[model samples]
Target: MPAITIWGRRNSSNVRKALWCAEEAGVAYTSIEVGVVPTLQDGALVLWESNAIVRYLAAQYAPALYPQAPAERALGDRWMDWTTSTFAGVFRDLFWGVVRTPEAERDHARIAAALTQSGELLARADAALAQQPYLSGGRFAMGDIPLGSFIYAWFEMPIERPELPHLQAWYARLRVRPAYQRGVMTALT
Candidate 1:
């Protein structure tokens, strides 16, 4: 049996990132969702928070994903930070207002506003992707991990989005990866 176990609802974007990281690294692990918190257990060491879990996995078993070269690694780190820090609110407002709420309780105006805000924010990624194939650089890396998980939801949601060809192209590239398909491309909840 694989020594690593991750606990979180599979539908959660945070959990998806950790699962995708393990898959990308070819690490065997199990996922569960019966806890008060998301957790990762690697033998005796237990950790929480999706970013920390992915980072720990990359550091332990997939340095290429995480990188060691300071500049290269920093690029990935920056995108990861931007995903959580800058985009979380927009994503949550859009996702919860539209996807999670029932039709009766749903707030269409709020969803529309969030969609517009998210679209504007996502333009930054589209521009950066126009310059390179991946957020970290020409190749996919840890920086791509967090944002990639969210892309599935952005596309799957039933809402109008502004054209972002570069971002869409990057998303198309992600769709072909088997690990991403299994780990992050599950139906949005």
Candidate 2:
């Protein structure tokens, strides 16, 4: 058995962040599918919070994904933080409002608000992507994993989003990566 075990149900959102990192790192592990599958339980470590796990996996197993240069590394790091702090909350509202709430009981106003707010937040990323090819600065890196997890839902959900060419373009780039394919892009519930 693989010493590294991740426990949780599959096809979730935030957990995808860690799973994608694990995939990109090429770290051998097993999913012992409950609370959160990508919950990294490597030896004594019982880490949750998808970003922390992603950071650990990237830093420990695949340092390349975590840039060596301070400037290069920090940019992507901020995006990861922004996604978790700023963007994901709005996204959570949007996801729960749409997916879980019954249609008749749905709060259209709240959903609309989340959609609008999410669009505004994503524009910030789009602006960043305009200059760089990836959120990590130049190429794909650990920074891309966090926000990238939410993006599939943004595009998949039936909400009218503001035009974000660079963001979508970067998203397109991620879709092609084999690691992204295996880890992040899963059927939403």
Candidate 3:
């Protein structure tokens, strides 16, 4: 067995962050589908939560992706933290209403509100990306995984959005990566 074993369904964006980080780090691992997914197993170590799995793998195997320098790593940490703290709410609001909820049972009003709110919040990322190719800076880093996971769903959703050129360009760059293509770029539904 590989040193790492990931437990999660491929379709879950949270789980994909873990899988994508592992792929980026060139860490070999086995993956299994699950319900409350993205549990990690390495020897006697068992880990849960998607962000923790990504952080652990990147720290262990890929320094560039996670970074060690305080400033550099902190940038990554900031975005990841923001994704969980600030963006997750808007993302979940939009995701749950549009993708998770059945169409007949969907709340159009809630989805619209979420769309507006998420768009406003994403503009912050857009402005940041206008200054750099990646959220962490010129290069892709751990920060990108968390928000990048959400970006896939945001773009894929059947909803109108203002043209965020910089954000779109960033997404385009992510699309070219084999790891991202395989992990984070899957169908949202």
Candidate 4:
């Protein structure tokens, strides 16, 4: 058996990030379908939020993936928190409106607003990417994995993405990872 067990739907971006981090950390884990089971199971360190799962898995399997120091780690934690509290909804709304929503249900107004927010957020990521190859540094690290998953969706979505050349290049770099294709890049939701 794998050394660890992760429970979530494969299509979930949060679960995908955890899975990707596991691969990068060289830790073995098994993913179970927990989000959409016929019957709910009893709790055992039960995790429902994607960000929490990413934190738990990183702290456990790849401590280095968390920042090496408390301050740095806290900063890292802040980014993760910001991603969920501030960024997730904007992107998800934009993605659904642009790619997933049925023609009748499409909300161009909301999508346009979401697109603006997503664009600004993406530019922030691109600037970071330009300065550091990965979010953390030159090498691929923990901070990069989770955000990387989102960046994949951001760029790949069929929309008029702004010119974030560095970000695009960074995405190209991530595409080389076999793990990313297996875990994060699942052809959109």
lDDT of 2 at 79: 95
Residue 40 in model 4: lDDT:
14
> Which residue runs of candidate 4 sit more than 4 Å off their true CA positions?
1-3, 34-44
| CA-lDDT, candidates in order | 0.87, 0.86, 0.86, 0.72
Model 4, range 69-149, lDDT digits (tens) per residue?
Answer: 776666446557767777888888888887778989987889999999899987887887778787666666566766777
Which whole-number lDDT from 0 to 100 does residue 111 have in model 3? 86
Please, what's the RMSD in Å of model 1? 1.5
Residue-level lDDT tens digits of model 2 in 1-189: 776777765577777787778888887888766433357788889987888888888889999898988898898999999998899888889988887789998889989999899999999999999999889988889888999988988888877779999999999999998888888888887
- Please report, as a residue range, the 10-residue window in candidate 3 with the lowest summed lDDT: 28-37
Cα deviation of 164, candidate 1, in Å: 0.5
> Which candidate number would show the highest lDDT if scored against the true structure?
1
Candidate 3 residue 13 Cα shift, in angstroms, is 1.1
Rate residue 88 of model 3 by lDDT.
82
lDDT of 2: 0.86
Candidate 2: which stretches are off by over 4 Å?
35-38
Measured over all alpha carbons after superposition, the RMSD of each candidate to the real structure, in angstroms, is 1.5, 1.5, 1.4, 3.4
Write the candidate numbers in order of decreasing lDDT: 1, 3, 2, 4
Compute each candidate's TM-score over C-alphas: 0.95, 0.95, 0.94, 0.83
- Candidate 4 colliding pairs: none
Instruction: Report clashes for each candidate as comma-separated counts.
Output: 0, 3, 0, 0
lDDT at 19, model 1: 88
